[PDB]
């Protein structure tokens, strides 16, 4: 009766959709998909934008 009651809510999330990323998707592809690889040849390994 004296201890404060604690109710818990649980959520689980995953990676976002391409559509909901908005113009950021295009603004990162302009920066990586063409600029870095073609004009620097860095040959890196990078994850997806999402």
């Amino acid at each position: 009766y004296l201890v404060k009651q604690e109710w818990g809510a649980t959520s689980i999330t995953d990676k976002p959709t391409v559509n909901m990323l908005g113009g950021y998707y295009s603004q990162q592809q302009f920066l990586r998909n063409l600029d870095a690889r073609s004009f620097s040849s860095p040959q890196p390994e990078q994850p997806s934008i999402s």
Partner: protein, 40 residues
């Protein structure tokens, strides 16, 4: 698809800008060479 069409629109605009710059440079050089050749 929307991202892709935006990307191609940007690429096309860039290509038109490059072509316009080249054409302007060439036409300026050609007119100036015309004036010089007319002098001689």
């Amino acid at each position: 698809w929307a991202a892709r069409t935006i990307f191609m629109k940007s690429q096309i605009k860039r290509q038109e800008a490059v072509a316009k710059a080249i054409y302007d440079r060439e036409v300026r050089s050609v007119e100036l060479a015309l004036k010089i050749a007319q002098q001689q």
